[PDB]
Design a protein around this ligand. Structure first.
Ligand SMILES: Nc1ncnc2c1ncn2[C@@H]1O[C@H](COP(=O)(O)OP(=O)(O)NP(=O)(O)O)[C@@H](O)[C@H]1O
Length: 257
């Protein structure tokens, strides 16, 4: 398309992450613009499967969603070039010394920002399926954007749904809808309020999907206001239909203060 750029017009500077499917690098699109470069380790994923994430992003363009800038697909090492987010994932940020110092007001902000990005995704008739703090990125101005549309569909090779973030009807019946993303959002609120703690501490994945089939919900966590817990408990309603829309969450969270 007009998304292709020559390999020469990007310089990779610092390595950010590893993984089985390739690497992520900080870089520059012809010197001028700071970018993130996702690298495919040839042989691992299919090239078509690796680019499905990019193909998806071509359609998904909103401020609270990491934007795609371009791709390099003509030559063996395939690149996905996206907007650089200075503070990394929300998970890592929340756990850093700096993030440990961010008070509850700005946590509700982060949370409301993601609800905004998700409200676009549901308005666009899409599902994300992989919504969690590790898949949300933070800019220098402390803006949150949704990332990682590897599992996002218009309503898989590699690819593992996040069991501990996935709605019970999605696990047990394979029923992924925007309402299952609302479930995931509730867990993402848990991650925010606890500064990046793992869901269901000390519970294996199997324990969790068994516990959920018995109506387990995480009890009110320390340093979480009734009102914020009621938002979580709203996302964790058994019947998917009875869970609120993202447009509602963005409203209720935004006026939280
Ligand atoms: N746009 C970006 N700006 C800055 N850092 C990023 C960006 N995208 C990814 N990273 C970092 O690179 C790492 C991997 O990113 P991610 O998009 O999760 O790749 P992945 O292979 O899909 N998932 P994982 O294997 O769990 O890291 C994370 O630790 C992020 O901190």
């Amino acid at each position: 398309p007009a998304w292709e750029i020559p390999r020469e017009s990007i310089k990779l500077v610092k390595k950010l992450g590893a993984g089985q499917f390739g690497e992520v690098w900080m870089g520059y699109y012809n010197n001028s613009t700071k970018v993130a470069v996702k690298t495919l380790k040839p042989g691992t994923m299919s090239v078509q499967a690796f680019l499905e994430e990019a193909n998806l992003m071509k359609t998904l363009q909103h401020d609270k969603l990491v934007r795609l800038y371009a791709v390099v697909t003509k030559e063996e090492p395939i690149y996905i070039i996206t907007e650089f987010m200075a503070k990394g994932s929300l998970l890592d940020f929340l756990k850093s010394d700096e993030g440990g110092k961010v008070l509850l007001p700005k946590l509700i902000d982060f949370s409301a920002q993601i609800a905004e990005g998700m409200a676009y995704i549901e308005r666009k008739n899409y599902i994300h399926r992989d919504l969690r703090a590790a898949n949300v990125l933070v800019s220098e101005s402390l803006m949150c954007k949704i990332a990682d549309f590897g599992l996002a569909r218009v309503i898989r090779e590699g690819a593992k749904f996040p069991i501990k973030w996935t709605a019970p009807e999605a696990i047990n019946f394979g029923c992924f809808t925007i309402k299952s993303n609302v479930w995931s959002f509730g867990i993402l609120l848990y991650e925010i309020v606890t500064y990046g703690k793992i869901p269901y501490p000390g519970r294996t994945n199997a324990d969790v999907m068994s516990a959920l089939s018995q109506g387990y919900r995480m009890p009110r966590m320390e340093n979480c206001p009734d009102e914020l817990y009621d938002i979580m408990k709203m996302c964790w309603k058994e019947k998917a239909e009875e869970r609120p829309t993202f447009d509602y969450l963005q409203s209720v969270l935004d006026d939280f203060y």
